[PDB]
Amino acid sequence: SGQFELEILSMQNVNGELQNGNCCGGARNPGDRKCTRDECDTYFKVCLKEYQSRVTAGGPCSFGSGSTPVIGGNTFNLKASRGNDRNRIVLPFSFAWPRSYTLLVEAWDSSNDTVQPDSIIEKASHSGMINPSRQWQTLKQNTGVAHFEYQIRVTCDDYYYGFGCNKFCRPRDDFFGHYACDQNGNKTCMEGWMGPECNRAICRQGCSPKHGSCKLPGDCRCQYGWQGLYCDKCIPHPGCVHGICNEPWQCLCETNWGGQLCDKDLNYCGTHQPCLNGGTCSNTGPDKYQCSCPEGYSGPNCEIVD
Ligand SMILES: *[C@@H]1O[C@H](CO)[C@@H](O)[C@H](O)[C@H]1NC(C)=O
Ligand SMILES: *[C@@H]1O[C@@H](C)[C@@H](O)[C@@H](O)[C@@H]1O
């Protein structure tokens, strides 16, 4: 989104003549050929269109057209003046600025009280190249009887960048992005954000790429069944005692532990030493054993004496 602006700087028509050779409304004085009966009522028409190597006099004003109201007589100098809504033409555009253009600028005499219509004083035309910039470029139409000067520029609208004023960037800090804008309209992510729109939170250094995730920067939220600072430890089956997991909800037994919960001792003899009075213990199953009793002892643990 941009604007092509045109400002009138000066007009000099010392005798008050039209392009056709006649005076701006009135009779020419025989001899001195001075136009003394009236002065021009000078206004300007502007036509902006696509580049033409061979500039046509007519045709459509594709990029826009405009006119100023009457802004002075035969001669006026606005060079030391500021320039207001009356002596300037604004031509907005929403298409990417093509750099190349054709510009028609004409000085006209107003006649809205007499028999004759509005008549052209002088015409300027050219084709050129212009990039977005706040800097004005002066152009002078000083080849005919009436001379005029004007300045032009192309400016980008707010948050627009590049040669076509077409690249949009407005800084943001919400669920659509967390960034600032470059001098080129590029997005520069706030600390803790990544991706083209700076909308992907950077997770805790070491966060599991398989089981860890983000919503806010610096965190590590675990996938269901995963735990730990880096979400890289599985959660064993609830109820698991002497077992481990490689995957969530597993209960893989440690040595000499049995059962789905790894709570059944396969070395009851080693852990409890239940055979009393010099008896020998034998592991025979989960939480199971058998005692072989010396002479004079009886019972499951050789506890019955005599
Ligand atoms: C930065 O801006 C330039 C000019 O528009 C563009 O070519 C380039 O791809 C941009 N870089 C990034 C990271 O978008
Ligand atoms: C196991 O069996 C019992 C009866 C005793 O003889 C022990 O010394 C042996 O280790």
Ligand SMILES: [Ca+2]
């Ligand atoms: Ca007039």
